[PDB]
Design a protein around this ligand. Structure first.
Ligand SMILES: Cc1cccc2c(-c3ccccc3Cl)c(C(=O)O)[nH]c12
Ligand SMILES: [Zn+2]
Ligand SMILES: [Zn+2]
Ligand SMILES: [Zn+2]
Length: 231
C-alpha cells in the first residue's frame, strides 16, 4: 500500500507508517516535463519529531507540516537534509519559519550555496571522511563516501532497523540511471559496500525516490550504476 508516483498529485503529501515512531513522507514534483516521486523520513524522539529531508519545494513542505500535525500531532523540532539538491533542501525556509532547526553537513551547505539552493542553518560535524558516523538523537548519520553526490548521507534508525539510503540508493523499478550529473560513478559501488558493511542488520531500506525494500536495493543500485558506468 505504499503510494506511488501515479497516486499523489503534485502538491499533496502522504505519510506511511513503517514502525512505532517511524514514518516516511512521500511527495511528487514536476521537472523537465515529467513527474517524479520523492521520499523522506520522520522519526519520533520522545514528544518531538526529527525530520529527514524536505518534501521537494516550499509548497510540498508546507503540506508536509500540515499532514504531520493532522496525523501525528507532535512538533517537528529538527530536520536534516541528506544532500544539496532541491528534493532534499527545497522547503528549508518553510521549516525555519516554522521554528524547525535545520541541519546539513558543511559540504552540503557549501554545495547548496554554490548551486543557489536553500541552505540549512546548522552544521553536522564529524562526517567529512568516508565511513564516518555520528549519532543524532534517535538516528545514526553515516557518510558512506561519494555516490549520487559527493555529500550524500544515509540515516539509520536502530530502534526499528530502518535504513534511509537517500538518493544514493535506487528503487527496483529504476533500471537506468538518472540525475547523475553530480555523482561519482567510480566510487558509488564502493560507497554502497560501506553501507552494507556498516548496516548489515537493516530490514527496511528506503530510497530517495520510490518504493522501499530490503538490503537487495543495494545490490540493485550497484547493478544499475555499473551498467551506466559502461554506457
Ligand atoms: C533533482 C532531481 C530532479 C528531477 C528528477 C530527479 C531524480 C530522478 C528520480 C527518479 C527517477 C528519475 C530521476 Cl532523474 C533524482 C534522483 O535520482 O535522485 N533527482 C532528481
Ligand atoms: Zn540528488
Ligand atoms: Zn534525489
Ligand atoms: Zn535490480
Amino acid at each position: 500500500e505504499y503510494p506511488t508516483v501515479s497516486e499523489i498529485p503534485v502538491g499533496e503529501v502522504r505519510l506511511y507508517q513503517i514502525a512505532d515512531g517511524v514514518w516516511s513522507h512521500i511527495a511528487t514534483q514536476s521537472f523537465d516535463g515529467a513527474v517524479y516521486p520523492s521520499n523522506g523520513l520522520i522519526v519520533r524522539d520522545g514528544d518531538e519529531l526529527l525530520l529527514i529531508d524536505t518534501a521537494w519545494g516550499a509548497k510540498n513542505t508546507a503540506a508536509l507540516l500540515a499532514e504531520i500535525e493532522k496525523q501525528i500531532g507532535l512538533p517537528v523540532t529538527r530536520a536534516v537534509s541528506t544532500h544539496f539538491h532541491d528534493d532534499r533542501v527545497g522547503g528549508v525556509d518553510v521549516l525555519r519559519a516554522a521554528g524547525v532547526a535545520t541541519y546539513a553537513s558543511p559540504s552540503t551547505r557549501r554545495l547548496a550555496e554554490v548551486e543557489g539552493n536553500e541552505i540549512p542553518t546548522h552544521s553536522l560535524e564529524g562526517l567529512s571522511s568516508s565511513g564516518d558516523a555520528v549519532r543524532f538523537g534517535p538516528v545514526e548519520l553515516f557518510y558512506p563516501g561519494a555516490a549520487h553526490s559527493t555529500d550524500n548521507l544515509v540515516v539509520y534508525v536502530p530502534s526499528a532497523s530502518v535504513l534511509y539510503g537517500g538518493c544514493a540508493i535506487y528503487e527496483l523499478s529504476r533500471t537506468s540511471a538518472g540525475n547523475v550529473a553530480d555523482a561519482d560513478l567510480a566510487e558509488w559501488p564502493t560507497s554502497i559496500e560501506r553501507i552494507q558493511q556498516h548496516y548489515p542488520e537493516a530490514q527496511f531500506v528506503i530510497p530517495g525516490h520510490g518504493l522501499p525494500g530490503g538490503l537487495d536495493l543495494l545490490k540493485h543500485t550497484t547493478n544499475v550504476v555499473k551498467a551506466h558506468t559502461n554506457r
